[PDB]
Amino acid sequence: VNSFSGYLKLTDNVYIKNADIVEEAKKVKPTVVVNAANVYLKHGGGVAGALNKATNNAMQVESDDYIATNGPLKVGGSCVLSGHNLAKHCLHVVGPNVNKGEDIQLLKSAYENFNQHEVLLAPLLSAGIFGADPIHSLRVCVDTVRTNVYLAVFDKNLYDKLVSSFL
Numbered sequence: 321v322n323s324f325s326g327y328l329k330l331t332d333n334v335y336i337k338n339a340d341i342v343e344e345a346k347k348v349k350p351t352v353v354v355n356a357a358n359v360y361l362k363h364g365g366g367v368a369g370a371l372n373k374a375t376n377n378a379m380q381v382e383s384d385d386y387i388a389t390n391g392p393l394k395v396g397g398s399c400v401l402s403g404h405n406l407a408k409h410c411l412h413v414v415g416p417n418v419n420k421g422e423d424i425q426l427l428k429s430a431y432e433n434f435n436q437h438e439v440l441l442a443p444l445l446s447a448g449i450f451g452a453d454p455i456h457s458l459r460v461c462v463d464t465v466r467t468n469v470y471l472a473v474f475d476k477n478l479y480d481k482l483v484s485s486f487l
């Protein structure tokens with residue numbers, strides 16, 4: 321028994337909720353929150369900018385130090401950094417950005433990073449301004465992640481479409 325409440329049951333291991341991931345993390349303070357990162361950990365917009373803004377830019381400061389030491393992530397890759405005021409840990413995961421011409425096949429590789437964590441609060445990878453169809457991202461999530469994932473979808477109209485079209 322954990323502290324996520326309000327999640328509609330999609331599968332055995334996937335629950336889903338209509339929420340902004342930032343406001344969700346502030347309430348639950350999960351062990352792991354997933355950021356929809358880019359390879360440079362440049363948190364300008366979307367979930368990354370919203371998560372980063374909620375940490376008063378401490379996420380960006382930590383991220384810049386990580387990149388200066390280690391170089392960029394791979395598309396499909398991840399790193400674990402601090403969760404700051406939002407979670408114990410932030411798993412920064414790079415899904416492919418369709419709008420930059422990255423290979424959508426790497427979405428499954430991105431979701432495999434979630435399997436290293438027993439429980440996560442996460443968004444649908446490659447969604448929003450990453451340019452992929454959320455219905456596809458949800459399908460890959462359900463077919464790839466085996467650990468317990470609590471998904472957040474910000475737009476009500478999209479959340480409703482995701483639930484109503486889920487097979």
Ligand SMILES: CCC(=O)Nc1nc(C)c(S(=O)(=O)Nc2cccc(C#N)c2)s1
Pocket residue numbers: 339340341342356365366367370443444445446447448449450472473474475
């Ligand atoms: C101002 C606060 C705010 O925007 N919070 C949000 N929380 C969620 C779950 C969304 S999302 O539903 O759009 N998922 C989503 C997934 C991947 C990338 C992007 C992008 N860019 C978005 S946005």
